[PDB]
């Protein structure tokens, strides 16, 4: 789920 983590994004920049």
């Amino acid at each position, epitope marked *: *789920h*983590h*994004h*920049h």
Partner: single-chain antibody, 229 residues
Framework: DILMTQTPSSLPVSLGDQASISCRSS???????????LEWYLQKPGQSPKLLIY???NRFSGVPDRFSGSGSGTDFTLKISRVEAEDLGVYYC?????????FGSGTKLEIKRGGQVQLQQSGPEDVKPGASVKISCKAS????????MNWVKQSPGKGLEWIGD????????SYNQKFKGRATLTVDKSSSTAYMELRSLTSEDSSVYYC???????WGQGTTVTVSA
């Protein structure tokens, strides 16, 4: 792991002309929240990469609409109408939708011939193989803990590589497995400084290391780590 394929690698152009760069992902980079974290960067020789386009088509504050991003799913395009001397350099696409984030191989936009927030990185390091190194990134001009801090490696070997990131506020981390836990990201709130520790260094770790925050909007000048016996 998503592979970003950039085309073409070399793009000769005359001033005033229109350049068009393509980028393709090995698989969809549509994030589950609905966004598509596709970014375009421009790097001039001797400098750090600079953000041009994010989320496929948003222009970073300050970038002229001569630069235009488009695309969808796995197909993306960057178009520069009426190229200027300032546009010359190497362009990179990047996906920040799925960990580990990855960059394209790059496109060299060169001329046809004929006829205040800032990130300060620590000094260069020269170490012996098997040794360990620790570089810093002092932040200022913004709230250090409101944004994730990213670390990027750059070597002629494989261009740009995302190492991992850290939430300065709570210590939450995200790492690129390719580094096999040899990298440790830490932080110091009191001084708004981020740190990166890399151990068991080999010649392959010799590169320029960058810290970048606010989703690639700000970069450090980079730190050169040379590993020689």
């Amino acid at each position: 792991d998503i592979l970003m394929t950039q085309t073409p690698s070399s793009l000769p152009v005359s001033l005033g002309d229109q350049a068009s760069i393509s980028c393709r992902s090995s698989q969809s980079i549509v994030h589950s929240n609905g966004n598509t974290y596709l970014e375009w960067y421009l790097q001039k020789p001797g400098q750090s990469p600079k953000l041009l386009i994010y989320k496929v088509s948003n222009r970073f504050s300050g970038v002229p609409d001569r630069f235009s991003g488009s695309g969808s799913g796995t197909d993306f395009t960057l178009k520069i109408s009426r190229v200027e001397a300032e546009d010359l350099g190497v362009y990179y696409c990047f996906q920040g939708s799925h960990v580990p984030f990855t960059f394209g191989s790059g496109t060299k936009l060169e001329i046809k011939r004929g006829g205040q927030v800032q990130l300060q990185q620590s000094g260069p390091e020269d170490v012996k193989p098997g040794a360990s190194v620790k570089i810093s990134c002092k932040a200022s001009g913004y709230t250090f803990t409101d944004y994730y801090m990213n670390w990027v490696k750059q070597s002629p070997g494989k261009g740009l590589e995302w190492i991992g990131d850290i939430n300065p506020n709570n210590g939450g981390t995200s790492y690129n497995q390719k580094f096999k836990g040899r990298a440790t990201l830490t932080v110091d709130k009191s001084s708004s400084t981020a740190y990166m520790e890399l151990r068991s260094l080999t010649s392959e770790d010799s590169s320029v290391y960058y810290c970048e925050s606010q989703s690639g909007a700000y970069w450090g000048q980079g730190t050169t780590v040379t590993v020689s016996a």
